[PDB]
Amino acid sequence: GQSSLALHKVIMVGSGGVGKSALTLQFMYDEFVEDYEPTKADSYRKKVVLDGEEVQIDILDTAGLEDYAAIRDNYFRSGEGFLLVFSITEHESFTATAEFREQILRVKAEEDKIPLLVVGNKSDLEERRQVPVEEARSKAEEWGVQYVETSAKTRANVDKVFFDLMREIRTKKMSENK
Amino acid sequence: GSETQAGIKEEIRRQEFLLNSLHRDLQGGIKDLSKEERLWEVQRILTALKRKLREA
Ligand SMILES: Nc1nc2c(ncn2[C@@H]2O[C@H](COP(=O)(O)OP(=O)(O)NP(=O)(O)O)[C@@H](O)[C@H]2O)c(=O)[nH]1
Ligand SMILES: [Mg+2]
List chain A domain ranges. Answer: 1-178
Q: Quick check: A149 and A120 in contact, CB under 8 A?
A: yes
- Largest Cα–Cα distance of chain B, in whole Å? 44
Q: What is the DSSP letter of A128?
A: T
Which residues are CB-neighbours of A121 under 8 A, at least 6 positions away? Answer: A18, A19, A20, A23, A85, A86, A87, A150, A151, A152
Q: Find out if CATH 1.20.58.90 is the number for domain B1-56.
A: yes
CATH 3.40.50.300 assigned to domain A1-178? The reply is yes
Sheet strands (E) in A34-126:
45-50, 53-61, 81-87, 116-121
Cβ atoms of residues A45 and B43 within 8 Å: no
Domain ranges of chain B: 1-56
Q: Sheet containing A116-121: which strands, arranged edge to edge?
A: A45-50, A53-61, A7-13, A81-87, A116-121, A147-149
What CA–CA distance (Å, rounded) separates A144 from A85? Answer: 17
Q: Give distance in angstroms: CA of A42 to centre of ligand 2.
A: 9
Residues making up the annotated binding site of B are: 28-35
Number of the ligand closest to the Cα of A16: 1
E strands, chain A, are 7-13, 45-50, 53-61, 81-87, 116-121, 147-149
Experimental technique used? NMR
% helix, strand, coil for chain B, step of 5:
85, 0, 15
Question: Do A119 and A83 form a contact (C-beta atoms < 8 A)?
Answer: yes
Closest C-alpha residue for ligand 1 atom 15: A17
